[PDB]
Amino acid sequence: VELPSLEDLKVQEVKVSSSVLKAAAHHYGAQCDKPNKEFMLCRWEEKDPRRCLE
Amino acid sequence: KQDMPPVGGYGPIDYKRNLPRRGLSGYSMFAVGIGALLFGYWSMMKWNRERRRLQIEDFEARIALMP
């Protein structure tokens, strides 16, 4: 099979601790709502997270 | 002439046998038992249901993140 390159990696990972990540944790997803549910259809409905990387 | 038997001063002590210090008998008991027992159940549903409210709150933070 095939795998995408070392490019489209090394993007800005949110380097925070787990407690400060669970600190807000409630106002975070409650107002963004545009890429996440689309990303869920990109993962739940369609499998193979290799067409699903963007 | 110096013998014993005194002129007076006697009791006696009893040969009696009694100490009926009762004691809250006769349907007064089983009454403090049942009401305090349901009082403990009355203390429930204000804590378990309250912790159940926090239990959905705990699972809320898991579902909000993880996309």
Swiss-Prot record, chain A:
Primary localization: mitochondrion
Cellular localisation: Mitochondrion inner membrane; Mitochondrion intermembrane space; Mitochondrion
Alphabetical keyword list: Disulfide bond, Electron transport, Membrane, Mitochondrion, Mitochondrion inner membrane, Repeat, Respiratory chain, Transport
Transmembrane spans: none
Disulfide cysteine pairs (residue numbers): 42-52
Motif Cx9C motif 1 mapped to chain: 32-42
Biological processes annotated in GO: mitochondrial electron transport, NADH to ubiquinone
GO cellular component: mitochondrial inner membrane; mitochondrial intermembrane space; mitochondrion; respiratory chain complex I
Domain CHCH: 29-54
Family: Belongs to the complex I NDUFA8 subunit family.
Domain note: Contains four C-X9-C motifs that are predicted to form a helix-coil-helix structure, permitting the formation of intramolecular disulfide bonds.
Complex and partners: Complex I is composed of 45 different subunits.
Task of the protein: Accessory subunit of the mitochondrial membrane respiratory chain NADH dehydrogenase (Complex I), that is believed not to be involved in catalysis. Complex I functions in the transfer of electrons from NADH to the respiratory chain. The immediate electron acceptor for the enzyme is believed to be ubiquinone.
The protein's name in its UniProt record: NADH dehydrogenase [ubiquinone] 1 alpha subcomplex subunit 8
Taxon lineage: Eukaryota, Metazoa, Chordata, Craniata, Vertebrata
Residues of the full protein shown: 5 to 58 of 172
From Swiss-Prot, chain B:
GO biological process: apoptotic process; negative regulation of DNA-templated transcription
Localization of this protein: Mitochondrion inner membrane; Nucleus
Disulfide pattern: none
Principal cellular location given in the protein's record: mitochondrion
Regions crossing the membrane: 24-45
Gene Ontology, cellular component aspect: cytoplasm; mitochondrial inner membrane; mitochondrion; nucleoplasm; respiratory chain complex I
Claim: Acetylation is one of the keywords in the record: yes
GO molecular function: NADH dehydrogenase (ubiquinone) activity
Keywords from the UniProt entry: Acetylation, Apoptosis, Electron transport, Membrane, Mitochondrion, Mitochondrion inner membrane, Nucleus, Respiratory chain, Transmembrane, Transmembrane helix, Transport
Subunit structure: Complex I is composed of 45 different subunits. Interacts with CARD15, but not with CARD4. Interacts with STAT3, but not with STAT1, STAT2 and STAT5A. Interacts with OLFM4.
Family: Belongs to the complex I NDUFA13 subunit family.
Biological role: Accessory subunit of the mitochondrial membrane respiratory chain NADH dehydrogenase (Complex I), that is believed not to be involved in catalysis. Complex I functions in the transfer of electrons from NADH to the respiratory chain. The immediate electron acceptor for the enzyme is believed to be ubiquinone. Involved in the interferon/all-trans-retinoic acid (IFN/RA) induced cell death. This apoptotic activity is inhibited by interaction with viral IRF1. Prevents the transactivation of STAT3 target genes.
Record-given protein name: NADH dehydrogenase [ubiquinone] 1 alpha subcomplex subunit 13
